[PDB]
Design a protein around this nucleic acid. Sequence first.
RNA 1: GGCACCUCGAUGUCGGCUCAUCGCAUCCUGGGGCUGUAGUCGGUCCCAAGGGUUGGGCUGUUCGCCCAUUAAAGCGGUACGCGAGCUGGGUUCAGAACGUCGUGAGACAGUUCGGUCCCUAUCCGUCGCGGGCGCAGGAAAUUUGAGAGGAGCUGUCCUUAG
RNA 2: AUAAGUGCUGAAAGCAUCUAAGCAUGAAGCCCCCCUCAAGAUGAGAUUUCCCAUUCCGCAAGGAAGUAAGAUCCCUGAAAG
Lengths: 142, 37, 175, 206
Amino acid sequence: TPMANASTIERKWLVVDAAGKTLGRLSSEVAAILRGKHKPTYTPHVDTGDHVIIINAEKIELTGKKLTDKIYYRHTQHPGGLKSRTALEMRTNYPEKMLELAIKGMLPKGSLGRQMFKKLNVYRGSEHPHEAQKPEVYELRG
Amino acid sequence: MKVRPSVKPICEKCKVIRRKGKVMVICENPKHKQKQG
Amino acid sequence: SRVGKKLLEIPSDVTVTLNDNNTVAVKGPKGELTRTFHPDMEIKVEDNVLTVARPSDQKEHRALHGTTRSLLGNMVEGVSKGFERGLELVGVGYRASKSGNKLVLNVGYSHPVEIVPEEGIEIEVPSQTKVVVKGTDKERVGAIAANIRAVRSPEPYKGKGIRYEGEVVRRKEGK
Amino acid sequence: TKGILGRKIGMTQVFAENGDLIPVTVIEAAPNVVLQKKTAENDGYEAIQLGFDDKREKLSNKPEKGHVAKAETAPKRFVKELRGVEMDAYEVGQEVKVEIFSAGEIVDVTGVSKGKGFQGAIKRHGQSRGPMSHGSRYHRRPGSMGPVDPNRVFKGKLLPGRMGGEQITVQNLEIVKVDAERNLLLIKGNVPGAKKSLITVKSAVK
RNA sequence: GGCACCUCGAUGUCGGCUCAUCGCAUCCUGGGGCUGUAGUCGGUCCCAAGGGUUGGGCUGUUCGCCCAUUAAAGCGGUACGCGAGCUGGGUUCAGAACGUCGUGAGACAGUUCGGUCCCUAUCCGUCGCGGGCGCAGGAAAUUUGAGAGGAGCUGUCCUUAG
RNA sequence: AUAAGUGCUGAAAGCAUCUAAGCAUGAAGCCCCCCUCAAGAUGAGAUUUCCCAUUCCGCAAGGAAGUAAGAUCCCUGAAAG
Ligand SMILES: CC[C@H]1OC(=O)[C@@H](C)C(=O)[C@H](C)[C@@H](O[C@@H]2O[C@H](C)C[C@H](N(C)C)[C@H]2O)[C@](C)(OC)C[C@@H](C)C(=O)[C@H](C)[C@H]2N(CCCCn3cnc(-c4cccnc4)c3)C(=O)O[C@]12C
C-alpha cells in the first residue's frame, strides 16, 4: 500500500530555454517532466506533473539535413487534402507548433495525456508573460 | 543531359564529377553531358 | 603542389585588418572587402603577410584550407587592382548603351533590357559592341557579367548575343 | 482602399454617351458614419466601422445607443467594417458620403445573395440528371456516393441542402453614375442580393 | 494465367448514365537539357498531377475503325470505382428456330427472336439545419484569424514584323 | 521559397570543376495574394458599449427570488423558410 496521491499535487513552473538544443532531446526531457516522471510522488492516473515554459523556440536547432528533409505532413479529412510543411517552413514561420507537435507525440495518449499537454506553453523569443508564478530557470540533463 | 544509370566517359576529355550527390560526366562535347538517375 | 602551403605577400595598397571573430576586412584605394570565414581555419598576421593554418588533415580542412586562403588572395587582388570582365556581342542590329547607371541592352528582343548594378559596380561601355563589368569582387563582377550573358546566351549557328572575351563559342553548320 | 455600404433597390437601364445600353444596379447609401475607428495599438489590425440605416429609438438597445452615441448620430441598423482604409482621412463621426466614387473607377461589390432554401443537387450544384425515359428511374438525383474501398463517403460529396444566403463578391464592377444628392450609386452589371437588402460597395482589389 | 486462402445459412456478374476521387509510367499547357535543333515544325529526355482532357457513325460491346473538331482528345487504381443510385442491350432460367453433333431424350465460348432489376435507412459515413450547455458576472453588436473549402484551363487575331 | 536546368566564387586535387563553405537565378507546380466558411481554435480568443454588484436565510460554504440591461413565449409577416 504505497501513496496514491490525488489533489495533494503542488505544481512547479520551469523555464527551459530552447536557444541551441535539438528538439528531440529537449522535448524528451520536457515531455517526461510534464507527467511528473521526475517527481517521487508519481501516480500514473492523477497528472502529478509540473508546468513547463519553453522560451526562444525559434532558435532550436537540428542535425544533418533535417531542416529541409523532415516534412510535417498533415492530412485534412477531405480527399486530396494532405498538406506538407518542411522543418524550416515550421521553424521560420512558427516554432511553437513544431515544438508542441513533438511534445504531443512524446506525451501519452488519452484524456489525461491531453490534460498534461495543457500544462506546457511554448513561446517565440523571450517575451514570456507568466511572471506571476515564480518560474525557475531549468537546465536539461544532456 | 543524358540521364542514364550507367554514366561513364565517352571520349578522352570527359570528366566524372560527383556534383551534389549525383555522378555526372561533364565534357566539352555537350552530347557527352551525362548524369545518373 | 598545394595552394594553401605557400605564402601570400602584401607589399602595398592592401591593408588586411583582422577585426572580429573570423571577419577579415581588407582596405585600399579601390574599395574595402569584408568576408567572414569558418572558425576552424586560423589566420595569422606576419608583418605584411597572411599565413593560413588548418587544425588537422581531413576532407573538409583541406577544402577550407584552399578556399579561405584563395578568397583572401582575391580580396587582396581586388583591393589592389579590382576585376573586370569583357563582354563581346555580335549580331546584325545588336547593340548596348548606358543611361546613367542603368545598362540598356537592345540586342535581339522587341523590348529594352535594363540592368541595374545596385551594389556599386562600374559598367563600362567603351564602344557600342563591348560591355565591361568592373569592380572589386570576382564574386560580384563575374556574377553581374553572367547576368548580362544570361540576357542572351550565344546561338551556335551564328554566334549572336552576349559573349565573353575569349569564349570559344561552339559552331554548328545548320544548313 | 475606399468603400461605402448601402442598400439595394433594383436594376435600371442606362445609355452611356452613345447608344450603348448598360444594365445598372441602383444602390441607395444615405451617408455612413464612422462609428469605431479600430487601431493596431490594441486590436492588432487597422480597420474601421461604418454604420448604415436610421433605426427608431424603439428598435434599438442601450449598448447600441452607447456605442453609437460616442459619436452622436442615431442608432444604426447595419454596422459593418472595412479593412486597411486610409486612416489619416477618416475620423470618428464623419459622414462617409457617396461623393467618394466617380463614374471612372473600378469597384468590388459584396452583398448577401438571395436565399433559395432546401434544394437538390441540380439547382444547387449544377449537376446533370439521368434520362427522363428509356426505362430509367434516375433523374434529379445527386449521383453515386463514391467507391467501395474506403467503406464510407468522402467529404465533399455535393448533396441537397440550403442554397443561398452566403456573402458573395462580384469583382471589377464599373460605376455608371453617382447621384450624391439622392445618395445613389449606379453600378454596371449584376449585384448579389434581394431587394431592400444591404450591399457594401468597396473599391476593387485590382 | 498458376494456387485454392475468405465468402456457396447468396460477396449481383459486362457495357452505358450519374457522381467523382486518386496514381504518374505527362496527352495539352508551364520550365528545361541534347540534337543529324538554320527558321516554322520536330525527335528524345528531365522536372512538374495545378487545371483541362470533344461531339457523332456502326457495334450490347470495353476495345477498335471512321467522320469532324481540339491546345490536348493521356494510361491505369478505387469489388475491371459506383444496380439497398439508375438502365438491362449483352451474357447466364423456363418458349422457339437454324447450322452441326447424338439412334435418342437432348448438347454447343455457335447463331437468332422474346423474357418479373425486391427493400418505409437503425448505426457509421456524407450534405444541410436546429436545440442544449460550455467559454469564471449577465448582455447587444463588430471582429482577428489557427484551420478549412474554392478558384486555379486555354485558343485565335493584330503589333513587334514579313 | 523552390524542381529540372543555368551559373558566379571556388577548392579538395599548383589546374579544371554549379563544390565541402559561400552566394544567384529559375515553372501553369509549393506558400501567399484572390473568393467563402471559420473561437466547440475546450488553446473556447479581441474590441466597443449597456447593466450593476440587490432581497431573504443559516453559524458559514452555499441555497432561492425578485429583477437590471437584455431576451423569449404569443402575434403581423417576407427579402427568409
Ligand atoms: C417483388 C420483389 C421480389 O424480388 C424479386 O423476385 C427480384 C426483383 C429480386 O431480385 C429479388 C431481390 C431476388 O433476390 C435475388 O435472388 C438471387 C437468386 C440472388 C440475388 N443475390 C443474392 C445475388 C438476390 O438479390 C429474390 C430471389 O427474388 C426472386 C428474393 C427472394 C426472397 C424472393 O423470391 C422474393 C420473396 C421475391 N418474391 C418471390 C416471388 C417472385 C415471383 N414473383 C414475381 N412477381 C410476383 C408478383 C407480382 C405481383 C403480385 N404478386 C406477385 C411474384 C416476391 O414475391 O417479391 C420478391 C421480394
